[PDB]
Amino acid sequence: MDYAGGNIASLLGAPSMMEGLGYALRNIPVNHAVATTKKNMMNAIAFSSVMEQTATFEMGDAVGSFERQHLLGLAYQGLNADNLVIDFIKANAKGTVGSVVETVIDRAIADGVIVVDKTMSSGFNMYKPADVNKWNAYAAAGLVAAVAVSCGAARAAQNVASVILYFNDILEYETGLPGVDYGRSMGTAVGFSFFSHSIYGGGGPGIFNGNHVVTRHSKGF
Amino acid sequence: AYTPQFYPGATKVAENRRNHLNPNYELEKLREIPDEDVVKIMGHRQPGEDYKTVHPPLEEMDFVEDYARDLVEPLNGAKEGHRVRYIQFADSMYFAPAQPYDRSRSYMSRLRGVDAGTLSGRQVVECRESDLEEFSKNILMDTELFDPATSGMRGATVHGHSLRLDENGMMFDALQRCVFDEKTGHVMYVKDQVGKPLDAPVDVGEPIPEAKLREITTIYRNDGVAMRADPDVIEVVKRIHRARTLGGYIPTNETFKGL
Amino acid sequence: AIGKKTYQVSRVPSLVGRVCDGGTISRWSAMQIGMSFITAYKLCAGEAATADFSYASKHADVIQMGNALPGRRARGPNEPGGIRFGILSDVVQTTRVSEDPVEQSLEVVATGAALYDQIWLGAYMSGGIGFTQYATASYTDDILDDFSYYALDYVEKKYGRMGTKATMDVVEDVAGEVTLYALEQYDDYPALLEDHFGGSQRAAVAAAASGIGVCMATGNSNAGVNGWYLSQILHKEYHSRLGFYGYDLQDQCGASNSLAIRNDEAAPLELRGPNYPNYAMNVGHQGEYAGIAQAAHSARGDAFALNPLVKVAFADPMLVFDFSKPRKEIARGALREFEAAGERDVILPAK
Amino acid sequence: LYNPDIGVPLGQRKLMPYKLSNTDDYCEGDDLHFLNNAAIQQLWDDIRRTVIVGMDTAHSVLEKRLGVEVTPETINEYMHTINHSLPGGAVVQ
Amino acid sequence: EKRQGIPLYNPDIGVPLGQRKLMPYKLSNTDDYCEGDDLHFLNNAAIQQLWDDIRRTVIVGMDTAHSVLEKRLGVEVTPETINEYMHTINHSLPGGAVVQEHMVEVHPSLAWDCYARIFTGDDELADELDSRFLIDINKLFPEEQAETLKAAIGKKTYQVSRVPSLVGRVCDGGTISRWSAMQIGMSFITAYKLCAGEAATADFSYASKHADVIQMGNALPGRRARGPNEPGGIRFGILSDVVQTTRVSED
Amino acid sequence: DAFALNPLVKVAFADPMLVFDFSKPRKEIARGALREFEAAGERDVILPAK
Amino acid sequence: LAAGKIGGKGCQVPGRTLDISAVSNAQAIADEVEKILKVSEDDDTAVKIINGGKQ
Amino acid sequence: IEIGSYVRYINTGTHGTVKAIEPKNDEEWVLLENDIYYRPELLELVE
Amino acid sequence: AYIDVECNDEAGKAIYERIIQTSLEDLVLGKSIIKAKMICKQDVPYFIIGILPKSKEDFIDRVLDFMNRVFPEGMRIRKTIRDKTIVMVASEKPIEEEWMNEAVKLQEELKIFK
Amino acid sequence: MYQIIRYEGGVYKNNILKEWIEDVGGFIIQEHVMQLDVYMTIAIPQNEIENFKEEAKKYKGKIVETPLAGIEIAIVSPSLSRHHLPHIACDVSEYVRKFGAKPNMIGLAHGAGKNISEIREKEKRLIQEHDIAIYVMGNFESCILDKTHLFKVDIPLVVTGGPETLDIPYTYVGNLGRRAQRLRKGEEIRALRQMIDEVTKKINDKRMELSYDPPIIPPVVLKDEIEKRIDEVRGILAPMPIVTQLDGLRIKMDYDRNHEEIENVKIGKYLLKDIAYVTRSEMKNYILIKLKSTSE
Amino acid sequence: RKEQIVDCRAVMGLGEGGGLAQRGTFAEGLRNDVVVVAMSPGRRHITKPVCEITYGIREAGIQTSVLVLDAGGGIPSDAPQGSLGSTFGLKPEEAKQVNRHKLCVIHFGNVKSHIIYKARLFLKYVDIPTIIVCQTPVDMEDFAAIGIKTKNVMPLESKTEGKIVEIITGVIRGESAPQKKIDEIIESIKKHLG
Ligand code: F43
Ligand SMILES: C[C@@H](OP(=O)(O)O)[C@H](NC(=O)/C=C\CCCCSSCCS(=O)(=O)O)C(=O)O
């Protein structure tokens, strides 16, 4: 019940071969998005983000209280709203993932997105979000910027899993704040790591899509 | 701007973790291993010969015009086109100076264009070969991040992170890459990191005294510094857990009032 | 719970499920039920009422151990990937022979490990060695037993078996205390550390103890998994290591998904299973999840967790496997003194 | 003095037997493999081969559609029949 | 003995069997007779093994793996290395664990039917390989049939993995492919020692156990929900190819 | 024709190491009906003799 | 919800019992669902009451 | 059997050419192209 | 397989039943044998072991290995009779005719076992 | 004075513990390193027992009280064949070893059968050279009762057999007959513990009779002195180069080549030949030392 | 028929319900004729394939010693591209304990490339004829291909002073060895011993 040995193809797979209900739109792999946009970074990011967030709207996830968070995620991660991604990349041209985390926290503090919760006995003034959804959007934009910085420094696409995982880790244990998608981004990064970095790994990062058991956990982030 | 803290806590373990995470903190160096010796232990290339390439130099190859992609300055190994290699370390649970997740966080905070992976008894970082050798010699091997007894550069068979130390205080090794020379009191690597023997053993210094290990370690232990003695880290972990739970339940400002 | 209703339990031969797959069982039972009905009441061999009997027995009144997994998973019914945690809790019969809630939860943990981690993830979705030392870590030595008994003692000293309502603060308190105690025990006794040499084993044991303690404090299974995930992310900071990379996928998404209400993420832990999207790849979680689900009800002294019919059906004394004491039966099988069915020696030549 | 042909002993703990929790039996680690343990295989087999059927709709259809009266004696006869038919015995044809 | 008085087989209930003469059954082209009960698939071990052999068969092509090893991984591939890999996979496929005594392994007598075989349309590589675990097309098929099969196959190398029957007995048919892939990956990373990084190992894993896998049957959708390597997914041409009478008969 | 749909399956099932020889399925079914067929998958070494 | 009949055929989870009055508050529930599902103002979003709020 | 002949090992089938015959310990031995001694009784002539 | 021991010693009966079971398991002979009866006569040293197989020479060799494993060490003089039922008498003394008669009685009793 | 115990700990910092034992005057009788854990049978003065317990708990070690770690036991199987050797006999030997004793498997040449069983004089003397002998018999009451002539040695005796109760004029432990499985059931473990208790009682009685007239020098310190003086004892390839018996030692070196060196060893101010009976052993031509009492 | 006394090891076994032997230990059979070498005290080597050969030899009338190697698992460090998983080795005291016996019997596993190099390292320090008991069908000559002295297939450049004197195939680890294999081993020992 599929088109296996045929010579006719489409971007969407058979609806009976979906990971879950409403998962049809998360079937375009990363390589297809990159090839369609002719290897343009911002356009490929916009394509992937648009598809993922439209799918989240289709899956019923972006309904009621989650619609604002998914809209902000789309605007700030895919469409470069407020120029956050470009600003972070420019500020960390020679930087690392930690410097990207620092710039993200500085921008969030300057914009009023996060405030100081309390200062513990051993210093470490805790941070709480004055705007939870906006903080998630800022963290997602910073995640994209960190991936761009690290993979432009290495000029290799094998760093994505580690960059996302440890960006979220460093941010969480630097601010006391939740990461992108409240740990779902970190879990999906662990999935990427064990899917593309071992003999029980399979394939590379170019064939990642949301319609897989390994990469379905983050709702378009 | 924003002056970054790096880790909560007041104990010595939290301070050491902060020091590892801090890129402006100069790690104290405890040995001098020549670059060629580090390359020999690494076992990827013969010292003195040129680096193998995976693609032509970035100037030779033609790429489409990409303003955002061109904002980031590439590594020299990327500029020339070198193969991506790895260096792997195993850390003992008995007061090793560096620990897997601590190593990965410090690597991603201090180095550019690195791929760090964390396991319970393993930690590997991948980078272009020239830069990988550079920061392996400068940071990974010569500084306090490495102890020749409780830690070991080793690929292939890794086992002994949870086992007890041997009679010389060295971590268990199923391949015996490094042995203890009692005449000089130094640890010598008789094999490279994957297991093929070296023609000339390389002196990697002598084991760090246990008193210094208690001070420079990044692990929490009942016999050493316990997490119960550091309530600040536990509070931050619980705050992260509660924030994750509240965000996964309903991500609004009203549900986060119970944070 | 059952009411004034009559049920029939059909146990088709094990050889049938060994030659064929697990989807054969319901159809086998349905055909034999239909034949027995038409021949016991002297009815016509084939009419409309025969179709009514067939439809009833094939789907209207049938109870399957595991649901089918069509699509990507591609599996039939009565497979270990379709068995929910509450169903497996009801399969274990320690609740009717013992009053110790920790013992009941730990027998369910042992059964869940031996089923999920060893069969479903060891061979159904992997191969070769499988995951034996990953699962035996939860039922070989008393490490998990000692941690769970400490959790129960700590809960009873300050909360009681049901003395508190499930809130965030009690989850943090119980899970953190149990995790700290378990990691201190690992530090203090090198024998325990060398027994659970892999980080995954240790993380699973400590988190299972923390979740069992939270369940014994609150009586809610979702609070139990929340405590499990807090224990995992506290273990990670305590030892700066959790397990093999690829282990903490569900543990990083867990805290958010434990109390979620979204369609793909919400499910009571009794209704969760190996087909839950987060739980559907990684070893060292599912058996302990089933144990936490059971402990949610062992705290209340409940007769069953999800299905009374499953509990009554597996209380049958004629079953080949004794589900009252799963660990004893596993030990008997390990010593080559367990008689198993499904063997075909009457139709085979002498060797 | 360094002799590379001495070797490294390994796996001392894995050689020792594994106790079983709440029991008094010691077994090898190889015998706890699901392929080498018939008890685990039977544990899975018993769950796999179990199906519960509610015999109330069938009784109602026998009563209201076929006009056949259902009594405990008839249920006993049905149980006797199905215990012969379910393993694979012949009842008609 | 076993049922403690619960009745199992009662010929007295139901139809009175044997009102007519219960005929014996011949078997076509064979001079032996048997009762009809002996031909039931549950009472006949031959039919059960017929299904077992088909269920536990997965064919994996090893040419992308060799090319990835040679070029990307920088490891030479020779007939001696192929023989070493075949030894490794033959030890490891049933239950084995290579140079690891601490790891739990399946009892060897429990999987005596497990084999890993190799065949290729390349003649020189075929005669350079060990005959212990090679399926020789030239000596198993007639000359014209062997030529046709070599032309259809090409100059490529394939390995056949026979997962032990017990694995299919305990589990379902979808277990066979995963078991084969896992053991193939372990044997490949053990025989050939590679000092490359782990991403390269992921590419090699795809090339070695997910690039040219041939399954006996496909998964079934809807109410026939089943995994691969189940009898409902086997096409008629595939079953015709399974039977080997074109080899030994011209009728 | 030497094969019908897949040459690889035809070559793979010509293996002499198979327990069931597909060259003569009728003969092997006859052998199995006579209780003279040695099948695999029996757990004789992990079960008690009594 | 009143009997904890979550799970499916013959399934009960003791302890997970909620006492709500959905049928009595059917109008409020329908209004809230309409507000949540509405796209802008004038879409074809309708939640009608059937059988006195029973459906 | 002589130098330049073609021989194969019966136990495995290794093809090679005889290099020299080097008796030792009042016993005949045969050296093949792979620099391995063999036994004449375990070798036979092929053409 | 069916295991029964005819002895007037209580401990010997159970211990040698376990010995027979273990010897059957070690050789993997449990499913290939219908019955295995052992007659223990220790006052006059001689033991009889009878085997009724299910339905080649390798199986016979395995059966004689089973007899060698089960029989006591001191009983070295042994003789066997095989007419589809293998029965062997072991004693430290030359085998007497009455012992052989008991062996044939056991053989005929095992033949009609069903 | 010198209570002998077993220390079970790790090899890390074990040299410092050995230095402490040497400082307080103890002797390391046995040492074995498996992979990372070391088992040490140590004899230390009784006045330092609590100090050594404290020191052991500092290294996270374990102290196991071994009531038989000063004796060597002759386990007499009827033969070394598959009937007795690979099971029961090894279980008896290993359980004896678990309490510190040094066992020796004695497989009789003609020990099998009912009326054809016999014991040679050389085997008799070899058995008598030990401290206590354990007989592993069969599981038939008549066979054992018609086999009493085997147990004729003037050594403490414990007879094990199948039947629960026997009527022999010796100590008997039942439910340990000829088997073919590893002894792991509860009843079998209980019977092994009963045999251990009987041999412990006999050894304690013999220790009391020896303490009535103590020897001039303890066997353990004599072994230490021999090791310090004789420089060929570290070249011995035997399992236990010097065996500590109840009232003597067994030196596993050639008697013809080394008896003169052994005798001319000065302990304190005495020569060894004047305080001990150095004689050739029936055991592979080794050297057997029997200590004299203070009465002579 | 003569008395056979064995010097039992000085250390106990592996726990309560485990094996009776201990790694890195030696049990002399007084009169040194045959030494059986076990790679480990585990169930894969001890009492299933090793003590059976031991009691077969002891039944044949030949005294036997059993030596459990300290590090018998894995492949030697001199194997191509080093060892993996674990390192095989032989101690000088173990070599001396082996070398005082007339003959040696050693039990190997299933992978040929492991067996050949393990035998080469073993015979680098053992100078008595040895018998290889393995499961896989291995040929006398593949040992000579890497420079091992062999009775039928000598190497041009011998890297070992020990002679592989017989290879016996069909003995599986952890499984009871049938009487036929024991008889073959006994016949080979007798006809290469006296
Ligand atoms: C030896 C390998 C190679 C590889 O690809 N996977 C291995 C081996 C693989 C094989 C072992 C069989 C074999 O022949 O290789 C299998 C069975 C894979 C599977 N099908 O599940 C396995 N491991 Ni692994 N593996 C395990 C474990 C572990 C622990 C060991 C910790 C230590 O420091 O000693 C770590 C993971 C971690 O770092 O967290 C581990 C690693 C490794 N594991 C790395 C380590 C070396 C490498 O870098 O290549 N295993 C354990 O933690 C216990 C459970 C155990 C699994 C089998 C069992 O459950 O019985 C086995 C599970
Ligand atoms: C979906 C699949 O992941 P994949 O798509 O990356 O193969 C998923 N997991 C796997 O990677 C496959 C098999 C499980 C292997 C895990 C063994 S844990 S022990 C090895 C630790 S190490 O090798 O990482 O060091 C599964 O099939 O269960």
Residue numbers in the entry:
A (entry chain E): 168 to 388
B (entry chain B): 2 to 260
C (entry chain F): 203 to 553
D (entry chain F): 59 to 151
E (entry chain C): 52 to 302
F (entry chain C): 504 to 553
G (entry chain D): 57 to 111
H (entry chain L): 10 to 56
From the article:
The enzyme responsible for CH4 formation is methyl-coenzyme M reductase (MCR). MCR enzymatically reduces methyl-coenzyme M (CH3–S–CoM) to CH4, with coenzyme B (CoB–SH) as the electron donor for the concomitant formation of CoMS–SCoB heterodisulfide. The structure of MCR has been thoroughly described as a 275-kDa heterohexameric complex with an active site that contains coenzyme F430, a Ni-coordinated tetrapyrrole cofactor sitting at the interface of subunits McrA, McrB and McrG, arranged in an A2B2G2 stoichiometry. McrC, a small subunit encoded in the mcr operon, co-purifies with the methanogenic marker proteins Mmp7, Mmp17, Mmp3 and the A2 component.
